[PDB]
Design a protein around this motif. Sequence first.
Motif, PDB file in Angstrom:
ATOM      1  N   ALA A 265     -14.814   9.832  37.153  1.00 36.11           N
ATOM      2  CA  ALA A 265     -14.307  10.558  35.742  1.00 36.11           C
ATOM      3  C   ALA A 265     -12.977   9.643  35.019  1.00 36.11           C
ATOM      4  O   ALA A 265     -13.134   9.717  33.907  1.00 36.11           O
ATOM      5  CB  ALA A 265     -14.054  12.055  36.022  1.00 36.11           C
TER       6      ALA A 265
ATOM      7  N   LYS B 265     -14.911   2.767  31.431  1.00 32.88           N
ATOM      8  CA  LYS B 265     -15.677   3.998  32.393  1.00 32.88           C
ATOM      9  C   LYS B 265     -16.233   3.294  33.621  1.00 32.88           C
ATOM     10  O   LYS B 265     -16.913   2.129  33.349  1.00 32.88           O
ATOM     11  CB  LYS B 265     -16.551   4.661  31.392  1.00 32.88           C
TER      12      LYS B 265
ATOM     13  N   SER C  61     -10.991   6.608  33.819  1.00 31.26           N
ATOM     14  CA  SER C  61     -11.036   5.407  33.112  1.00 31.26           C
ATOM     15  C   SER C  61     -10.399   4.239  33.678  1.00 31.26           C
ATOM     16  O   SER C  61      -8.912   4.418  34.068  1.00 31.26           O
ATOM     17  CB  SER C  61     -10.827   5.541  31.646  1.00 31.26           C
TER      18      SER C  61
ATOM     19  N   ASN D  50     -18.395  11.844  33.612  1.00 30.27           N
ATOM     20  CA  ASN D  50     -17.779  11.180  32.981  1.00 30.27           C
ATOM     21  C   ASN D  50     -18.375  11.115  31.321  1.00 30.27           C
ATOM     22  O   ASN D  50     -17.504  10.586  30.453  1.00 30.27           O
ATOM     23  CB  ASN D  50     -17.140   9.862  33.110  1.00 30.27           C
TER      24      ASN D  50
END
Lengths: 130, 196, 173, 104, 118, 51, 162
Positions: G146, G35, G148, G56
């Motif tokens: 947001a 993340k 990954s 996120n």
Amino acid sequence: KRYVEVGRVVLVTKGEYTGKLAVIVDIVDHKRALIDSPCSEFPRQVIRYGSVVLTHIVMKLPRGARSGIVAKKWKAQDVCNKWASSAWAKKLEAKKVRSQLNDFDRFAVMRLKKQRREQVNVAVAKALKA
Amino acid sequence: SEFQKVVVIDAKGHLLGRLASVVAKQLLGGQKVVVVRCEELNISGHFFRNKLKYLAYLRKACRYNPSRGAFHFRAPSRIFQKAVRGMLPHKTARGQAALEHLQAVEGIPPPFDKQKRVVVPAALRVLRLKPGRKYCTVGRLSSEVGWKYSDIVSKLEERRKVKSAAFYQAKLAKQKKIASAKAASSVNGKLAEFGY
Amino acid sequence: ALKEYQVVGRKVPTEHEPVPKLFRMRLFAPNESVAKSRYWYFLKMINKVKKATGEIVAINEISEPKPLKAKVFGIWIRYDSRSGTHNMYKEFRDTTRVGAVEAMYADMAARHRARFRSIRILKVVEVEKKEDVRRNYVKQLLNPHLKFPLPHRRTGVVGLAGKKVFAPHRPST
Amino acid sequence: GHRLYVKAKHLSFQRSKHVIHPGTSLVKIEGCDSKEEAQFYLGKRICFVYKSNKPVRGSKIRVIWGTVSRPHGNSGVVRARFTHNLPPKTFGASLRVMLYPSNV
Amino acid sequence: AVNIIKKRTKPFKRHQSDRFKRVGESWRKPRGIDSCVRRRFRGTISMPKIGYGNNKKTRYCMPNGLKAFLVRNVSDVELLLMHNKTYAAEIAGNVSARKRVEIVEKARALGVKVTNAG
Amino acid sequence: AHVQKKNPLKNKAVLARLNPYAKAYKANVKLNTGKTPKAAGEKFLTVLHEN
Amino acid sequence: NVPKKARKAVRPTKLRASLAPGTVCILLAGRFRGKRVVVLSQLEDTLVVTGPYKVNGVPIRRVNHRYVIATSAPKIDVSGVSVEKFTKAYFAKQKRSGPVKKDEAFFAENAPKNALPAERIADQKAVDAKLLPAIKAIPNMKEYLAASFALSNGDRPHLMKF
RNA sequence: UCCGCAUGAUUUAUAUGUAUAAAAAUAGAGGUAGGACUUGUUCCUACUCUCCUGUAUCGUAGAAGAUGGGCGAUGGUUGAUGAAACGGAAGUGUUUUAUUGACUUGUCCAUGAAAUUCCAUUGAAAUCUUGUGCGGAAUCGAAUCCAUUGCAUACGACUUUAA
RNA sequence: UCUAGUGGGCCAUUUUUGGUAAGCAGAACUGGCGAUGCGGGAUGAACCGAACGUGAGGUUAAGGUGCCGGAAUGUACGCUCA
Ligand SMILES: [Mg+2]
Ligand SMILES: [Mg+2]
């Protein structure tokens, strides 16, 4: 088509001057040549042919011409612009830009490529509609 | 940087031992290898000298029972397999497992003719042999030491090349329509500034 | 990496002659220690002097005055083969006398299996006139309109993708 | 869920021609082709992930962890030390090199 | 009694005791004129030597840092009154079940650890 | 006394224990502050370039 | 027997320059691995990151400075954030040495708002509200945070510019 | 024995995107709708695209990927079937069509993920045999011994015959 | 001071004598094996390197680095087709 001669412009591939434009000013022997470039940080030097690749630009340069004469005749012709306006140099410039993309930039390219894909698939199908 | 499960190698134009050493090392690193078109492999040196080398190999047989003796395989992929086996510790389990991860074949049989085939530049004849140095093709050496299938392989390879050309032609046309719909796109400008 | 040194030495003064003569040589050696050793090697075969009875009074490395100018170097050598001794003349194009000398040693190693110990360099001269060049393979390099294709190398793929085992396509010249 | 490690292969123990030193493993890292590029992975955590037959805490996944110690040779191979020396049957088996002790 | 390290945990078996039942495992110095073991050829078994001796601080100590003192009766356990953190009581094999109970009780009263309780 | 040797070239505190002068030691003094003449000479250069 | 007193003073950690507050970092380990988060402040050993929860799902939490990759993405202005409250004591678990009974049936209570106390969902919203204006200013930033991070085939981390 | 309603377990999983099928030469056409016509050892037409091999290309954003919308084309992915066509070198794979599901991040908002409050891990899905409730009936075998033969035979084995 | 084993040697370098020669016989010098493991010379008592308590890390010798096999299918210039 491409030959080692005085005035032939070369692109250095190995060594600390990798990826720089240069011109053969004197042919020492069948293995080495003395090269030069108007660029300030590039010094006039003897280089082995295996360290460079020949471009297609051949300059009108006299044998053994010194640094000042090479620089003048290089600017008199369009050599810097002549090399840059070519598919070879453009592909290398694109590679150089691609090497320096950070993670944010790679994300931006992915987003833009996604948009291009949608348009490309639509435009292909509509051409086929005729 | 090739860590893929299985690689398919087009043996055409490769030097036997140099390809053998690369493949053997890859097998020992855990890579599954398929070598196709083993009849198109090359060995440096003129034909007569390489023929004599196989004939000297063929002499070596167990005096008291040749059915024990060295088993001289004549087919091109068996000649390659022998070269690879000699470069593996094949009397150990580790070497045997490496050898079992190799599949060497003549021509390009149907599992592999629809798969990507790569080359090994360290073993390519055009890069490694000086021009004008005599060399031989393994398929010809094999056919004069008892291998029976030069003709059927050649006929099947011409048939495969016709189909592959048709496949390539269809793929050429499809890529052209995609490339036309790509260079006409407005998003090309923002991709240029990123090197794309 | 050979270097050129000038070495000046003399017999140590004694009562018989208190002003011994000074002798100079130009010598190609990898360092100053070898240069001095070579000086005494060559002086011993001409003069009644050893290292024990002589001294080095100066040693200077000589750099090339024009390292950017392609020249022709004629080298006279004396060498020992397995059967006898010969004098021979070789010519090399280079920008430094050191470069020509290194070319000569490699050339004698390759063509005659002559080791360093078996070669004495009689003289190294920069040949100025075209006709004084005795080898045609050298004077053909003095043509203003000299042209030839790139020599056959094993191609070139950067430094990194040349380390790749597998390539997707066959190379194209 | 996607990949956050570099692929690697367990090649051999450190050895001479006839003597092996299983305390140190030689590891080939995908994409790492020189001793200069091997400097990036020094100190990185490396793992050997394998499946057993008996579950532990509900899981049949087992891991042996290690650390990259130094480069090996000229071609990007590295030396790695694991908490338990790797078994020799894993020569040619896959390893994972993580980014976990990061300096970038 | 802190950080106990053993230089070796294998026992030094006698050469060829694995091949002949008449040759016991207990260590014997090979004295043969051709003995590969005595000459220490590579790949042969190791021989006991003084370099394998353990740290004088931790020598004789069980993993818990205590040394197993053999006790045959209650009065033997009473010997370990002041030496509670250095010696553990090992009850002798030939001590009766009755006396063993009295020994286990006396050790528990003194806080002496017993190696073979039960 | 002395359970562990410490390299004075790395441990600066140990280098102060030995050598009290290290604190005042001044390296990299500039002495080329003048016109810097050239000392080669006519005889030296003609001998240098002989042969 | 008493030990000697060691001569080992505790000096502050010096984090690398790339971990300045406002830097976007990729998390390498743990449940939020992969993340992209936003650095709020530098604690002694860790970075107080948020990577805004609304963007996120990563809340305010610490992360060891070794277990992140500091991206060179444009800095997110965290100037107007009260980071002097996120101390070690703020993130520290309640001392469970002694009077505990580790078993099951405590996952049900230790998870929802039945476990998350007040003023922790409140200051989480407060730092978020002070970061969305700066995130919205930079195009693609909200989508970037947001998404990954992952390694694709051909990726060579020792060569990639992050 | 086949499907089935659904229970457990294995592995594809040596996985971790582990995606990518022209052929041939190398003092060459590498060929890239390769352009340019008349389908031919000819174009001066397209000539610097060639030489950076793939550092490429394709994919790649969303609780191991959730729940609702305004815009924009009219497309893309996958799954179940249709009727197929092409695949024999080891074809078990490739392509297309009609119905019907699911998704779509092409562009823009809303709700949500936390205390697993600093790493010690694997995420789901289907695929094939096996324990079982069986509705549905069962479309269905043989070999060997004991016998027999003499085209066979030391013994086995072999060739026959057989209810 | 008392006493043990020993009183069949053998190999190499270098200097030798005898011998047609010898993996031969006899002497000189030093180093070795015998009593010496270990890295190297595929192998090997004596050749090269190096002489050994149990271990961790680092670096080397002699010798290597296509594969077997740890380590450049490294760089530079030539020569060579059997
Ligand atoms: Mg023990
Ligand atoms: Mg190796």
